[PDB]
Amino acid sequence: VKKLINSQISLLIGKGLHEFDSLRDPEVNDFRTKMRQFCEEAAAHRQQLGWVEWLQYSFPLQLEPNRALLVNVKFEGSEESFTFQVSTKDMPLALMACALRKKATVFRQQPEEYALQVNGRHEYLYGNYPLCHFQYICSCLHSGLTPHLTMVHSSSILAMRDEQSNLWSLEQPFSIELIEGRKVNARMKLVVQAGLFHGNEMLCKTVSSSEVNVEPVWKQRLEFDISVCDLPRMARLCFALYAVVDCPIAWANLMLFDYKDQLKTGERCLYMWPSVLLNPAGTVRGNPNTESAAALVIYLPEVAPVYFPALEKILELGRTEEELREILERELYEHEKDLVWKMRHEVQEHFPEALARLLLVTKWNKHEDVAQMLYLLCSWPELPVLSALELLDFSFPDCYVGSFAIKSLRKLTDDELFQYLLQLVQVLKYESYLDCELTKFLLGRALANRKIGHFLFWHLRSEMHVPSVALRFGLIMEAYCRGSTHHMKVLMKQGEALSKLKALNDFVKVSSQKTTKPQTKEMMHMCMRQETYMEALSHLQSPLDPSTLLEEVCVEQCTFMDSKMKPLWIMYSSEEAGSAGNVGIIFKNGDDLRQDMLTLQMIQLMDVLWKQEGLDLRMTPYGCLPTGDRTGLIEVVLHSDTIANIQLNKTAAFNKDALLNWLKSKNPGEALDRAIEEFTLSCAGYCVATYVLGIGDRHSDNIMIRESGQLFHIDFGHFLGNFRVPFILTYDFVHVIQQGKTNNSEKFERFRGYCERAYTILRRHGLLFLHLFALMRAAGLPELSCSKDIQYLKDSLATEEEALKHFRVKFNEALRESW
Ligand SMILES: C[C@@H](c1nc(-c2cnc(N)c(-n3nnc4ccccc43)n2)nn1C)N1CCOCC1
């Protein structure tokens, strides 16, 4: 029955479906019904896809942004495998051909009927791409390991697709009636400041309430300096309740128009949110804690059925100098703004990419000016992805503006969308109504690609404990589940594994105080070996990456760590995969993993940007994913250790040698020079990464080394210099770069070049970083709160020559400070 699926979605999304009904809201009812059909349409289209098209949905290719190698190939229903010697320039088809020919001669006798599955992973190799373009092959060629693949036939992929089925007339000013208030605070008098906003900008000057002593009654008329006909569609009425002899108490906002474009009237009770003065960026929906939250009773006076005019009507109304207009194009005065508005047609024709600057000069408090702009917009050419990401910020609130940005993001690759998905999910907080183009797009892309679908779910699910977004986020996940009954069940398994891990972590935390670690470890081990634990912790997709399969839990290899939140070290094995199935996951409960994930995503973007310029600084883009309330996962980077642990053996005469001696033991003979190259490149990338991102409090316990020599960072506590952090250079690292030699300028000057190139490449994309950090402000991160945080990134990135010289000033100060 359908009831079991409804109860399944409920337990999964972490909110009962009945709770959407209890509210008795037609906006919630319309979102649910409309979006459900949209997702069921998307689910249907998927079931009739060709086997390759389905493989592109389920297991999208892991691609990279000559030489011969041994590759092991086996067929689905057999233990028999053949090891072939193929090239890195060879296409998957030639490998499939070899695999077929060898099967035909052994068993005594077409490659376009198969696909190559990565052993013990939900990863596949297909398409006209040389084998060296696939991430699994590339990880194998660097680690030395042999790629193990499985020949999967069309009819078997088709069996999966089958078992995975389911107006202008009102010229009087805008006014309201502030009736009465409620709840606590000191003696003093309560003022209610009220303003009207279109994004970050006021449509008129604020009007404050008359001073009333502490449950208060106002019954006062508040009028605004704006005509009702001049109100923009996305106008926000913002309130702030505070005390004065200031002390802020509460805040609440609301759209003057509903989801059906109707100008509201009638009384309204406003369950306000506790303050840290006016917050326009805040949610336009009341506090769900209607019991303990302060309420503002207000009245929307009648003006009578007034609906915001249709596009056909907006377009009906909307239907040199030239030199100084270019000079201001590459924070501006009023005469400069008037010039841009006068020249608005020349902006569309010769500077389409300057649209954002034009959208900020338009008087949104004048319907005629809005119409004249919307008319230009309804003929405006598509903007590049970069400029479109700027148009998603709270500074651009108009619905038609918002719809144009999505229209420019449709061209985005599933790879590019994956990179900025964290920012696009945050932008959901800025949205005014449940039903939006952003949700329809995010949902459309989730259901068209199972990896986008996976991460969109976890981005939403991880924020379910946040009351301001719980309804929106819950509604989106339920809409998703209707479009994928099978994936819903897959994500449910993941939630059961994480449910067991929290209980096991709670036990560990308690036990670590009551007894010694070897005694707590055997108890963890004993608790894990219980039926329910063995079942729940095994045979699941990794929330860190759906292509990674967590098969049998290796209880003996599991442990906990000695740090504050006693994190769990959970290891896995798989016979099929061999070594690819020997993965590990770290479960952390107690700290906020959101920032660590962002820091790692920003470093992952830097890697992508460098790799695109041919520069491979041998980075370690390991997974970090918040899954719940101060709960998350970290990807285990195997064959790695901390600097502090390496600096103590289980032989060095001096500390400076310890690091180099460890590399010497893990990379003997001709391999050592490779490990030092890995160290030099990775070190340089993380020197530019930590510097630009403003990562301080870096020490031996949070910096790690792989047995390959690759250096990487962990447990990023504070970013954007939020303790102006300088460049960091360590004697122990410089020693390794300089090959143990006290003096080595060739090796050090090469390393100085890597730091320089890495820095200059990122400076060219400085706008990409600034747009993504701007969009990220929505998340609520105490380290990305204001413009001074954006300004940190502006200063660490800063003409190319006048900035590169200034980088050398910081680089030289870092080398001299090194003892
Ligand atoms: C020394 C230490 C060890 N840690 C790692 C390792 C690997 N990958 C990571 N992503 C990683 N990170 N990253 N963020 C973290 C946050 C907390 C803890 C760990 C973290 N830590 N490897 N090893 C051997 N323990 C030896 C005994 O067994 C338990 C592990």
From Swiss-Prot:
The modification Phosphotyrosine is found at Y333. Residues 66-153 form the PI3K-RBD domain. Residues 170-301 form the C2 PI3K-type domain. It is an enzyme of class 2 (transferase). One of its GO terms (cellular component) is cytosol. It catalyses: a 1,2-diacyl-sn-glycero-3-phospho-(1D-myo-inositol-4,5-bisphosphate) + ATP = a 1,2-diacyl-sn-glycero-3-phospho-(1D-myo-inositol-3,4,5-trisphosphate) + ADP + H(+); a 1,2-diacyl-sn-glycero-3-phospho-(1D-myo-inositol) + ATP = a 1,2-diacyl-sn-glycero-3-phospho-(1D-myo-inositol-3-phosphate) + ADP + H(+); 1-octadecanoyl-2-(5Z,8Z,11Z,14Z)-eicosatetraenoyl-sn-glycero-3-phospho-1D-myo-inositol 4,5-bisphosphate + ATP = 1-octadecanoyl-2-(5Z,8Z,11Z,14Z-eicosatetraenoyl)-sn-glycero-3-phospho-(1D-myo-inositol 3,4,5-triphosphate) + ADP + H(+). Disulfide bonds: none annotated. It comes from the Eukaryota. Disruption phenotype: Null mutants are viable and fertile but display defective adaptive and innate immune responses due to signaling defects in multiple cell types including B-, T- and mast and natural killer cells. Activated by growth factors and cytokine receptors through a tyrosine-kinase-dependent mechanism. Activated by RAS. IC87114 inhibits lipid kinase activity and is selective in cells at doses up to 5-10 uM. Among other effects, IC87114 reduces allergic responses, prevents the recruitment of antigen-specific T cells into target tissue, and affects natural killer cell chemotaxis. GO terms for molecular function: 1-phosphatidylinositol-3-kinase activity; 1-phosphatidylinositol-4,5-bisphosphate 3-kinase activity; ATP binding. One of its GO terms (biological process) is inflammatory response. Keywords: Adaptive immunity, ATP-binding, Chemotaxis, Cytoplasm, Differentiation, Immunity, Inflammatory response, Innate immunity, Kinase, Lipid metabolism, Nucleotide-binding, Phosphoprotein, Transferase. Residues 319-483 form the PIK helical domain. Transmembrane segments: none annotated. Its EC number is 2.7.1.137, 2.7.1.153. Pathway: Phospholipid metabolism; phosphatidylinositol phosphate biosynthesis. Residues 713-730 are annotated as: Activation loop. InterPro entries: ARM-type_fold (IPR016024), C2_domain_sf (IPR035892), Kinase-like_dom_sf (IPR011009), PI3/4_kinase_cat_dom (IPR000403), PI3/4_kinase_cat_sf (IPR036940), PI3/4_kinase_CS (IPR018936), PI3K-type_C2_dom (IPR002420), PI3K_ABD (IPR003113). Residues 554-819 form the PI3K/PI4K catalytic domain. Phosphoinositide-3-kinase (PI3K) phosphorylates phosphatidylinositol (PI) and its phosphorylated derivatives at position 3 of the inositol ring to produce 3-phosphoinositides. Uses ATP and PtdIns(4,5)P2 (phosphatidylinositol 4,5-bisphosphate) to generate phosphatidylinositol 3,4,5-trisphosphate (PIP3). PIP3 plays a key role by recruiting PH domain-containing proteins to the membrane, including AKT1 and PDPK1, activating signaling cascades involved in cell growth, survival, proliferation, motility and morphology. Mediates immune responses. Heterodimer of a catalytic subunit PIK3CD and a p85 regulatory subunit (PIK3R1, PIK3R2 or PIK3R3). Interacts with ERAS and HRAS. This is Phosphatidylinositol 4,5-bisphosphate 3-kinase catalytic subunit delta isoform. It comes from Mus musculus.
